[PDB]
């Protein structure tokens, strides 16, 4: 069923004698590639990468892996955008206070809670026609309130972040054996130029730099920190 | 003790906020630099006009990083809230996903895992905008240091902004009760009264947690990308905090004529307008922020307050004046309503005697007598001052006031909805206007004395008594039916037809009033009769009739209680309130609460019975008090604590009113004293015993 | 003694006749202005802004700002520097957590909070 997706996707991209098709395949392409890094996000986050016995992929996960290798200048692209969007309020200092929660040693446990998170129903339409208790009623959706920390919900995302960039980075390996790896063992792919591996290079640094510059900034304070601190140590009485 | 990341960044933005307050300072003393410091100070540095047009520069400069984070953070928060209401608005209140809805409530009840996921799951939908019948998930108060860092820019803003500083009739014109800051007010003839005004239409909406879009009408905003490509110009309705960051960053001579003007983004920034983009989160942060993020001086949340903190300010305020005079002035009442109002307004004409004119009397404490009748303290006070407002507001003859320094019909009457009354003149003899300047001191007694007095009045007599300016809208409030009629003509007068119209319906500039104000045809104009109304004018027909209709016919009623409420509370405690803080601050809720009752309310026992019986009678109790009518709700609050309106809010109630339960007997009635405010109820073995007695002691009137 | 400090401060800024004193006053100033606002801002955290009695002031903020109000342009731009100092790690999602306190009502609280820092 994947196989027969991608296979349409790819045909409809590579369709050039019909006007306005590549265009509205490309969109297509870009919300199908969006869904997918959602549910694969929360499938990594649920999950912890146990060293035990090398498995390194579970089923749904290579299902996911599969879709972005097939349609990799795109896919790293939404790959991108999902890791901005995880990473933001990270650094900006924003994020939502939450528990702290185990992660999931099993691909049995790990579908429980993605299946509550994305077997959802939309919200019906209307038929015919601390001090957070002293918030208005119609706002007490907008205020809360085991533990309820910030630093948990940091890290949490820092953690999502890092599963997507480590993905984007397997992907962009993989472009240069694109055709003996991914284009001749897989059915469904997407071809690949050398100008569009550049254009994929200059679109992710591009994307990166903000999170570069944040982290070099933090590291550089704290490591002068203790440079400064270990010499005032060896300075001291 | 608790190291949590919030605290510290709340502490860090407390700490910004205060070096914040000192450059604005700093910055608005410049004009006045060689008048406020150079002269007065002996060390001064000179300052010039280039010097401090390059520090204006700078600290521009410095200021726009914090500036873009806490416009992308705000821009972000409001289209959530936003997107939040319209969803309510939209969605089916029966659904457990409807902010509308009991398990949103936050405090009466998922797993971690499931909180981050939708959290994550949030954060990513919204990105490329993909959030649709999925309820935004954001905590508002974990933005506490964000709301320290507004308030630090807003006040930077306002006070270099100080620094710096139908037909278009102001009656017409929204005022400040009316309108919000930085929003245009719906078109008073466009939008039916149904939804322009909706506390017209449902007198019953204001109570002490209410929010102002409910009770004057939703506003819009003249935004978007509609003539407006400047960054702010154009409406917020990304959710995602990545795009509401790009926004406003890719947009990219006497010193005593400084003149400072602020362009952080290009534009010159008003803080109204920026008021009213971010109006959901500012409300939030006044009503969740106010202990800590409301403290600090020139706050725009405690600016912005809503009934709660003027409430708690004028009681506060009256309860220092109250303290301040030893002098405790009392009354003696009886029940016989003509001696009640004999006796009423000669003892209080002697508590008017021995003090010529000037500066207004001060009571400790009120405390009425009763001949025949025991009884001392609070309760008996409130007890006279709820006969006194139902004698005065019944609608049946008066006695003669001939007496008064030795005007038949009642006094009040009710134009529109009924509950609501507005005094009717008569021959405007000096008994009458002696009688109103009464009721204005007893309105102000119980202002000053914590207890409600009970006169409901309507709401633009509350504006007369407290010195605002009469706008048409509060005429919606006069009666809903012959409002409507004054806007569906002036609605037809924007029509091709309106001149035939207006000739059929031959109208002049002259009123039929009925016998509630004197009755006959009155003037508006001098020669108005001959004078017809044409569509050319009907603005101004309409103006003058609608203000004629309640403001002229009683200047003399009004005006004399305007002295009335003046000579007891001085006017510094007027100002700072509105007509619905006075109404719900002196007449307290219209209607008894379940639920009200419920937040205070303690209950002891004597009878020594088990402790499940006790809860089950309290349970029985709960149950009658829901299964119970208005009318019977009045009654038993005045069975409890002599008044039949509760305070606006916990505070005000005295006592905070108890129940005790009596060893069990069936042919005995509860009691209650109203001193303490204490009901005991005997502890009944069978329901219908329980439900007959409570029905007969609350029937005791 | 904040006067005559701040004279002195002022008279040298003011120096035209003696070559390369402007600068050595404008650093004096700076780092004087610096240490002042650090002792500002630790006393304002340290205190409450209590509406009562609308005092608004207690002396030793009063002299932090009369000697902001003389050097004026040397100390908003040194007032600048600090609040960004302050809230650089707010707006990085950098801060270090720490444990609630009670503000001080009074000045003497104040006072012995600031004398042990």
């Not at chain 1, 050039?16 to 590549?22: N, V």
């Not at chain 1, 907008?142 to 820092?158: G, M, W």
């Not at chain 2, 149950?623 to 505070?651: C, G, H, N």
């Amino acid at each position: 069923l994947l196989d027969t997706l991608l296979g349409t996707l790819v045909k409809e991209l590579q369709n050039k004698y019909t006007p306005g098709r590549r265009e509205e395949a490309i969109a297509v392409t870009m919300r199908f590639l969006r869904s997918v890094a959602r549910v694969f996000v929360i499938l990594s986050v649920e999950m912890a990468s146990s060293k035990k016995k090398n498995n390194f992929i579970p089923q749904p996960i290579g299902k996911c892996k599969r879709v972005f290798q097939a349609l990799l200048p795109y896919a790293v692209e939404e790959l991108c955008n999902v890791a901005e969007s995880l990473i933001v309020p990270v650094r900006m200092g924003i994020a939502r206070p939450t528990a702290p929660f185990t992660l999931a040693s099993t691909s049995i446990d790990a579908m429980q809670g993605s299946e509550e998170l994305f077997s959802v129903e939309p919200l019906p339409p209307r038929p015919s026609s601390n001090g957070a208790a002293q918030a208005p009623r119609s706002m007490q959706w907008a205020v809360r309130n085991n533990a309820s920390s910030y630093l948990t919900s940091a890290s949490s995302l820092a953690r999502a972040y890092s599963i997507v960039i480590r993905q984007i980075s397997d992907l962009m390996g993989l472009i240069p054996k694109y055709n003996h790896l991914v284009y001749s063992q897989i059915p469904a792919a997407v071809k690949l130029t050398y100008q569009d591996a550049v254009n994929l290079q200059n679109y992710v640094e591009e994307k990166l730099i903000p999170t570069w510059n944040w982290m070099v900034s933090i590291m550089d304070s704290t490591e002068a920190q203790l440079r400064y601190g270990s010499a005032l140590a060896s300075a001291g009485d | 003790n608790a190291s949590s990341y919030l605290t510290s960044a709340s502490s860090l933005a407390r700490a910004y906020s205060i070096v914040i307050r000192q450059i604005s300072d700093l910055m608005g003393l410049i004009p006045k630099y060689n008048h406020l410091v150079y002269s007065q100070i002996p060390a001064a540095v000179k300052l010039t006009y280039q010097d401090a047009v390059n520090l204006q520069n700078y600290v521009e400069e410095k200021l726009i990083p914090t500036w873009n984070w806490m416009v992308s953070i705000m821009d972000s928060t409001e289209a959530q809230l936003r997107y939040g209401s319209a969803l309510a608005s939209a969605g089916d209140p029966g659904h457990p996903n409807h902010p509308l809805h009991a398990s949103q409530n936050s405090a009466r009840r998922m797993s971690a895992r499931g909180d981050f996921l939708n959290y994550a799951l949030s954060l990513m939908r919204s990105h490329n905008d993909e959030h649709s019948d999925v309820l935004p998930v954001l905590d508002v108060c974990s933005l506490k240091h964000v709301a320290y860092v507004f308030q630090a820019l807003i006040y930077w803003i306002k006070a270099m902004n100080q620094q710096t500083t139908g037909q278009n009739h102001p009656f017409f014109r929204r005022s400040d009760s009316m309108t919000f800051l930085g929003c245009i007010p719906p078109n008073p003839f466009e939008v039916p009264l149904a939804e322009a005004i909706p506390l017209a239409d449902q007198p019953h909406l204001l109570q002490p947690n209410a929010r102002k879009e409910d009770l004057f009408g939703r506003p819009s905003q003249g935004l978007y990308s509609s003539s407006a490509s400047s960054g702010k110009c154009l409406m917020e309705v990304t959710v995602d905090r990545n795009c509401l960051e790009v926004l406003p960053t890719k947009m990219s001579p006497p010193l005593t004529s400084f003149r400072p003007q602020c362009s952080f983004m290009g534009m010159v920034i008003s803080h109204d307008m920026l008021l009213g983009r971010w109006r959901l989160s500012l409300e939030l942060f006044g009503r969740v922020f106010m202990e800590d993020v409301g403290a600090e001086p020139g706050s725009i949340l405690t600016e912005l307050g809503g009934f709660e903190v003027k409430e708690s300010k004028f009681r506060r305020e009256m309860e220092k004046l109250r303290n301040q005079q030893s002098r405790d002035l009392s009354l003696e009442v009886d029940r016989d309503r003509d001696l009640l109002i004999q006796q009423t307004m000669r003892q209080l004409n002697n508590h008017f005697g021995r003090r010529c004119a000037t500066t207004p009397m001060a009571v400790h404490r009120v405390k009425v007598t009763f001949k025949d009748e025991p009884g001392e303290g609070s309760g008996v006070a409130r007890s006279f001052y709820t006969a006194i407002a139902q004698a005065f507001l019944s609608n049946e003859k008066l006695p003669n006031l001939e007496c008064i320094q030795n005007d038949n019909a009642p006094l009040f009457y009710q134009p529109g909805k009924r509950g609501f009354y507005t005094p009717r003149p008569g021959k405007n003899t000096e008994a009458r206007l002696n009688c109103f300047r009464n009721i204005g001191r007893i309105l102000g007694l119980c202002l000053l004395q914590n207890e409600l007095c009970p006169i409901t009045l309507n709401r633009h007599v509350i504006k007369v008594l407290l010195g605002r300016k009469v706008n048409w809208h509060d005429f919606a409030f006069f009666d809903p039916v012959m409002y409507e009629s004054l806007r569906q003509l002036i609605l037809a007068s924007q029509s091709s037809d309106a001149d035939a119209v207006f000739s059929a319906m031959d109208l002049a500039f002259a009123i039929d009033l009925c016998k509630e104000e004197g009755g006959g045809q009155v003037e508006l104009i001098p020669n108005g009769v001959n004078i017809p109304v044409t569509p050319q004018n009907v603005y101004e027909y309409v103006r003058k009739y609608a203000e004629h209709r309640m403001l002229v016919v009683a200047e003399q009623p009004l005006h004399a209680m305007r002295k009335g409420l003046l000579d007891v509370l001085p006017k510094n405690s007027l100002e700072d309130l509105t007509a619905e803080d006075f109404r719900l601050l002196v007449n307290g809720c219209g209607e008894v609460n379940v639920q009200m009752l419920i937040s205070f309310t303690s209950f002891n026992d004597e009878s020594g019975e088990n402790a499940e019986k006790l809860l089950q009678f309290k349970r029985w109790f709960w149950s009658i008090v829901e299964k119970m009518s208005m009318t019977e709700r009045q009654d038993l609050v005045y069975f409890w604590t002599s008044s039949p309106s509760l305070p606006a809010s916990e505070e005000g109630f005295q006592p905070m009113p108890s129940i005790t339960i009596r060893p069990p007997d069936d042919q005995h009635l509860p009691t209650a004293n109203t001193c303490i405010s204490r009901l005991y109820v005997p502890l009944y073995s069978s329901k219908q015993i329980l439900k007959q007695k409570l029905l007969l002691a609350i029937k005791t009137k």
